[PDB]
Structure formats: structure tokens, C-alpha cells
Amino acid sequence: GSHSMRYFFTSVSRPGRGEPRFIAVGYVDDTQFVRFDSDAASQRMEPRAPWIEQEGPEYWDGETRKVKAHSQTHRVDLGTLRGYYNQSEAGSHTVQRMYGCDVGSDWRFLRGYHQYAYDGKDYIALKEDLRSWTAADMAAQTTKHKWEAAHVAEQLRAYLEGTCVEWLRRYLENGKETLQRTDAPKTHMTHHAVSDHEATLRCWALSFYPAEITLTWQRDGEDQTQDTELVETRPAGDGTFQKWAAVVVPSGQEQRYTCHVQHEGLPKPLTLRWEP
Amino acid sequence: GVTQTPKFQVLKTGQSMTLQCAQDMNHEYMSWYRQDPGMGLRLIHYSVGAGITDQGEVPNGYNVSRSTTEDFPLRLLSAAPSQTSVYFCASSYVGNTGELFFGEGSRLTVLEDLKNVFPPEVAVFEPSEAEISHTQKATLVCLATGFYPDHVELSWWVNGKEVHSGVCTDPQPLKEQPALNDSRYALSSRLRVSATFWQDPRNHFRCQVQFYGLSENDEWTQDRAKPVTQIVSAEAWGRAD
Amino acid sequence: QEVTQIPAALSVPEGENLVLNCSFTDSAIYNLQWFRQDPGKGLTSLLLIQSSQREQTSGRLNASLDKSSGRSTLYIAASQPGDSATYLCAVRPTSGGSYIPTFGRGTSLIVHPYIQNPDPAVYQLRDSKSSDKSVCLFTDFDSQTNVSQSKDSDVYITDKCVLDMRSMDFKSNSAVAWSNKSDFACANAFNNSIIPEDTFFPS
């Protein structure tokens, strides 16, 4: 199917501290493969997936230099943004950046992205055509002006359509065992009486990959979207994900409800029904 | 911009020294080069940010550090004659146009013995009456001689104020003894003015040579005066005769 | 990964439009920058061309970039003597993660002043402090003449230097020679050089 590579950066100013905090992580689809933490002892990009450990010394030294450069650029940005918003050095602020690329089934470029945020909200983002910017407010217009004058988009576009996709393909191949896989969900249902007239039916999906999944409940043929309690898909810690969906039903009517599970690792959607 | 210091420095083999480089443009990238005849610019060390430095083409004998964004000091733990050169610091963003910004340059001379250091002797030669009549112009010539190392700045001053118009100073000094590696130098400059200006006895002309030599920390004990950083000048007045 | 500038030397008459060449082996560059440097002086940046741009202009200077062909050309219109210097070309990589620039060795450029009315002459100037010592001044010759070093040890001769008297819109070349040798005299000072046949020698 389609794939993606994405890098996520978090920059946090720390008043009274010698240095702000900087954390970078890289992902291919839903699998993390690298990380950097400015506070850590090594001061290098580190592997977080087995298939990337294959990369040689030149790869790691190069990624380390580039991430340390990202760190320095972000250290400066913290001060710049405080200026644009005329904020004091007393408070801690956050900058986040995400960029990457998506490829299709043929593994060819489908789309690129580069988004930037300040204090949890959009600040500036590269549009889909990868030629122009969308500025969220007055302050971001200064950044937009600066980036247009320096022809930032043209250079960035080249990375997203070339380097980004080329390395994603390399990772997809080198990490085929891990990345080019699908683990179908292991499903089951639980029952808990809420009272003497009502009970909770919880549908479970476990050990699946990728994270994309759809759990839905039905009462004899019809959707229960509104009355369904759904939790966020969560990581198991072993590389797979988990999720559940529940409904409260009248004692004695359990058999009328059905849980439907949709996932790419399944040849056909699954339908579960409770049985005493 | 980029400010590096010192501009000139004399060292004795074995002495330590640190060249300073500071920039106020929030450049993430900073680097040091040495430039030598027939060698071009060779990178010594560089850094893409605080807490990181990397070796260049010729790192041996040099040490750097990047504790802050603004500074990138180059240190010579134990100066050697092979380190005599002109050093340049260069910084830039790791983005934007990526344009390099060089500092003014630092000239370093490392000597086995400071006894080879000599301040220039300066003399001004008056325009010839022949040139005066033949061209209605008058050329004064300044000669700075017998100095070592080649660390001088020559300027002309007319009636107390520096002038640049009508001046030409040799681009580089010449070796008084070309066959020697430690030859003393000579430098010449000309200042050309109208015959009328030269013939006015009220006009004062002075050739000034700023020499960069030894400091108070240097051992001397000789008979000849210690060749410390100093200014040596020569002067002449206009004349009707 | 390799930057070359050929020719490495260029001599041109004042006023002509000139061209400086730059070539690089790896087309994957982030930018290309042109600088100029005078002997014993620093490096002044002239133009910066980003990899997505085709050219840049500044005054009489204009440079083009042909990334695909691995070359850049620096154009200087209506050259002036003051343009004399070594021009250096440098490029930086678009990827790799080093950020290290690659410099060319440079092209030394000499723009010879146009001397409207040559008046080659050799004058003797005396020390303002001692009529005892003097120097010989060879001046006002046109671009065709070259000043050679002395064939004698302890005879010092500088190369031609051009001075500009702006308020008069007048420029002139000159070289200086001096020595403590007893046989040295302005009449024989520039004997090792080819000087204009009608050079003025006052007595």
C-alpha cells in the first residue's frame, strides 16, 4: 500500500536553564526508527529500529550534524518568536515542526509536508503545491515574508520530492520484514453488568499493525455511532496497537448487538456477537 | 557582522594562543581557515552549532570549541613555524541563502627566536624639480625598510588629516634578501599632488607606518630597543625652492 | 566536489567587458558564491546565487549559474583598475550533512589603466632628512611596459603601482628603485627592464 516518512521536532524554552530542550524522532509509517535528545549524553542521532542499525558511520555522522543544526536553528527561533509576540523570557514556550513525504503503492512521490507550530497552534505551513505558504496570524506573516525572500519553498520541495522519497524507499526495502507487514487484529468481547437491567459490551482489537483500524457497533443491522464509547488507538509497546469500543445495553438484549472490525490485515471484515 | 582578533600576532615556537571569532547574526555555522601561497583556503575546523565541532582538512595542531552561538575560538596549544599563515573565520546560516561571511583575517607569524623581529625605518623623499616642471605634478615617496615580520599598515597624512586620493602603496612588501626565508622587508608608497600644493611651505606631509611586533610579555634583553608594536613616521614640508 | 577556474589569470585593458569562469564536478549544490580578494587583504563577497536561481546582478557585476552543466560565469562590465584582484568561486552541497564549502583556486585579474598621455620619465628624489640618500621614480608610462626586478643583489625595485588623482580625473603608473650600491644611479636603475625609447631622463 501507500507509505510515509515523517520527522517530528519539539523545542521547549527553559527559563533559568543553560539550554532549551530539543527532541527529534523519525518514523516510517507507524514505526519509529531514530531519535535525538539534546539533554542526552551521546549528542548523536540514535537508532530505534533494528533495520536502521545497518547504516554505516557516514550515515550517523551526517544525521547527527543535521539534527544538531536543527537544534541550533530552533534555539534561535525560540528567541525570535518571543520577539514577534513580544513575550517575556520568564515563560516557557513550545515550537513544533513536522515534515515528511508520502509515496503510493508504486512507491513514487504522492505528497510532501512541512508544518510548524508555536505554543500548540499552527504557525506556518507549506501548501500542498509545495510552492507557497499559509501563515496563521500576523506574526507568521513575517516568517512567510522571510521564507519567500530566501526562496525556501523551492529548496524544501526538492528535498521532499527527491531525498525524502529516495530514503523512504531505501528504508522500506532494508526494513521489509518490519515495515512491509500487517498484523491482523486479535479480537474478542467482554461483558460487564452495570446493573440488574443493563450491561456493558466491550469489543477488543489487539496486536495489530498498522494502527489504522475501524471498530463499529450495530444493533441488529443499524449503526450505534452516537451511543458507542471508543478509546484512542494505543501502543502495546511491542510494535503493535490496541483499541476497544463499548456500548451499554439492556440485560437480555446482548445478542442483538454486533461489533464490526475493519483492518488491512484482514481478508474480510470481522463480525463479533456476544454469546453466553 | 564577523569580528575576529587579533589582526596581527607574533609568537615564539611553543607559545599557546587563541584567535577569537564572534558573529552577531545568529549564524549556526562557523568555521576557521588558513590561507597560504599556492595552497588556497584550507579548512581547519567547523561547527554547525553549540556543543558540536568537526575536523576540517587540516585540524592537526588546532583546537576549537563552540559553547555559545556567537563565539568560535581557534586555539593553538603549542605554536609551530608551520602555523605561520593568515587565518580567516567564516560563518553562515545552515539555511536561508547559505551565504558565507568572512572575518577580516588574522596574520600569525611563529618564530624560533624573537631576535629576528625588527621595526621599520621610515623615510620620505621629496618630489624632483624635474617632475614638477615636466608634469606640473609632484610625487612624494615613502620607504619603510628593514622590518620583520611583514606586519605593517602604511598611511599618508596631509596637514594632520589622512588622505587616500593620489596614493598608491605596493600591494605586498618585497624581501630585502629574497634568498632567505627570514628576510627583512621593505615597502614603498607614493603620494602625488599638484605642483602648486607641493610648492606651498604651509603644507605638511607625513608617512605613517603602524608596525605590529612584540608585547610586554615577551623576553628581550638586548641593546637594541625592544621591537614592540609601534608607529614610525617620516615627514616633509612643501617648499618654493 | 571539485571547483576549477580557468583561466587562472586574466589581463585586460580598462573599459572592456570581461568574463570569469567557474566549473564544478558535482551539480548537487545549495548555492554558489563569488568573492574577490586583494593581496594581503580579506575576502569580500560579491554575489550569491541560490541553486534555484539562474543569475544575480550587482552594479557592473552579473553572474549566471548553469547547475546542470556544472558551471557559473561572472561578468564584469566596463572593467576598472580597481577591479584588479583574485576572484574566487565557492559552492556548498545540497545534501550530505557536512555544510562544508568547496573553493576554487581563483582567477587573478589585472585591469590595466588607460594612460591617455604617456610621459615616461625617471626622476631622482632626495630624502627630506638627508640630501644624502635618494630613490629613483619611474613614472607615467603606459600599460605596455613591464617593470623587472634588479639583476643585482641589494638593489630594490617595486612593481608598477597605479595611483589615482580623482579631482583631476588623472591616473598614473610608477615603480620605485633604490640601493646603497655605489654604482647605482637613476640612469641605470631600470636597465633590466624594457623601457620606452623616449623615456625622459633629466640631468
Binding site: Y7, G62, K66, T163 | - | -
Partner: peptide, 9 residues
Amino acid sequence: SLLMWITQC
């Protein structure tokens, strides 16, 4: 592989 040239905001 990371982006190499990052421009300050």
C-alpha cells in the same frame, strides 16, 4: 534522512 538546510523563522 533529515532535511539539511533549515531556515530560521
